[PDB]
Write a protein that holds these residues in place. Sequence first.
Motif, PDB file in Angstrom:
ATOM      1  N   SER A  44       0.832  -1.192   0.000  1.00  0.00           N
ATOM      2  CA  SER A  44       0.000   0.000   0.000  1.00  0.00           C
ATOM      3  C   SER A  44       0.875   1.255   0.000  1.00  0.00           C
ATOM      4  N   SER A  45       1.937   1.241   0.809  1.00  0.00           N
ATOM      5  CA  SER A  45       2.832   2.386   0.905  1.00  0.00           C
ATOM      6  C   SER A  45       4.231   1.971   1.308  1.00  0.00           C
ATOM      7  N   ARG A  46       5.180   2.849   1.003  1.00  0.00           N
ATOM      8  CA  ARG A  46       6.579   2.671   1.364  1.00  0.00           C
ATOM      9  C   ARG A  46       7.213   3.966   1.847  1.00  0.00           C
ATOM     10  N   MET A  47       8.037   3.877   2.883  1.00  0.00           N
ATOM     11  CA  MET A  47       8.854   5.003   3.325  1.00  0.00           C
ATOM     12  C   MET A  47      10.182   4.407   3.666  1.00  0.00           C
ATOM     13  N   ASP A  52       3.836  -0.935   4.295  1.00  0.00           N
ATOM     14  CA  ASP A  52       2.608  -1.499   4.817  1.00  0.00           C
ATOM     15  C   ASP A  52       1.686  -1.959   3.706  1.00  0.00           C
TER      16      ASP A  52
ATOM     17  N   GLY B 148       4.027   8.400   0.797  1.00  0.00           N
ATOM     18  CA  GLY B 148       4.579   7.149   0.295  1.00  0.00           C
ATOM     19  C   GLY B 148       3.592   6.158  -0.301  1.00  0.00           C
ATOM     20  N   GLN B 149       2.348   6.575  -0.497  1.00  0.00           N
ATOM     21  CA  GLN B 149       1.316   5.679  -1.010  1.00  0.00           C
ATOM     22  C   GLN B 149       1.626   5.292  -2.458  1.00  0.00           C
TER      23      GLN B 149
END
Lengths: 151, 151
Positions: A44-47, A52, B148-149
């Motif tokens: 769903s997302s990345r940092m 997640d 970050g999505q």
Amino acid sequence: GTENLYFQSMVTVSRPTITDLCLVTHDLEASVEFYTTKLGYTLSSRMPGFADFEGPGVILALWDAQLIRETTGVPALAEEPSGRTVMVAVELSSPVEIDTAYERLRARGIEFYSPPADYPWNARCIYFPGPCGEFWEYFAWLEGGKPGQLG
Amino acid sequence: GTENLYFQSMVTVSRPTITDLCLVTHDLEASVEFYTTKLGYTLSSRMPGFADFEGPGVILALWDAQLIRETTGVPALAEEPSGRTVMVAVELSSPVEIDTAYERLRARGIEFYSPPADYPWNARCIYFPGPCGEFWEYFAWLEGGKPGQLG
């Protein structure tokens, strides 16, 4: 009577609502590979040091231990744990579905601590380790349902 | 065309739905005291070395490490961990609510790693340890929302 209404307001402790479960990882990309390919989660997302997955329900997340320490000062475990640290549980709708899930998961390379079995708490369960120190339980209630409920 | 429909069915990995988060404890009664009196959870059921709390949402549970080992063979951590092992996150609806929660929780004896602050991932957060190796995060998005999505 009025003072009591105020007292009740002030002393009630409002229970939080957990929205995200974030596992502490030491190898984000290997963890991402496990939850996506083995358990079917979708990114769903990345940092930095973080990923997640999509809902619905609780959001599963992964966050590198070193990054947690560096950015928050929370002393996340330095290395892979010496035993299992937390349990993630998935309730299924029948005992027979447990055996089906077991075969599908095992076919994808999930390693279980034991084959399906009935446990003394009136559930049929399977358990497997994940890559972030956690283990997973899939369980379904046998006839009579959940024991130990308070009244 | 028909064979493709069958292929798609067979290879889809169905994502599980997490229903319960079960922390590994080494002192069940002290853990029960923490989640009930400090965080406002209400006891729902009890079994040997086990307690869980009322919903709605994900069910929070506690299970003694020794009992897990003895009843399931899962090698739950023998002793209290040397650092934090998992993160439980609670999303709030505004940054200013974070500071309010901080003061209420601190007044109940919750010990935070730092006072409220803005973090580089565009959230205002607070962090505190619980008694089962976990830490808790309360967070709320700053203007612009979640970064970050993926698209």
